[PDB]
């Protein structure tokens, strides 16, 4: 039996069973907690004649 | 040795280079003595830096260890 | 000899007009078996795949 | 930040009616089921909120 399946080359599934990737949960942000910005579209009329 | 043990000619060329350098020095014997460890230090002592696989025998040291009694078990896949 | 060409041509026409696509890799994915030749006995999955 | 398989056992086949269960059955015909009651999920709630 041992000359059957027992072998060194390991596929992905057995690797996952033995070693699964660990997700990275804790992450920190030091900036501003925002996702919307205000952008100019047309430059202001300056200087003007009035 | 190259013709009898099937050595790689590339390594034999390096050995010949070492011999020639030894000859071109002030003292052949002194040079050989001072440089005797290039091949070990560069192949045996720096081997398997990144390992992929293979087999390693499973041996057991029985008691009394004074008796030097070892028994063979089998192979363990490497990692 | 007379009847063969029409059958063959109609078969090609259907093959070139139907939206169906035949992908044998679906069977391999569903089996999801990692075959290796060093087996005196054959597993049913390898047998059916062969 | 994952590299290995995720959801792949479920990507085999049709995902529109997925469910998780397991069972085993004795010789005399008695069967035992286990249906894990799905807990909550912050990601699903948050994506529905957005």
From TrEMBL, chain B:
It is found in: Virion. Coiled coil: none annotated. Belongs to the reoviridae RNA-directed RNA polymerase family. This is RNA-directed RNA polymerase. The chain holds residues 239 to 317 of 1267 of the full protein.
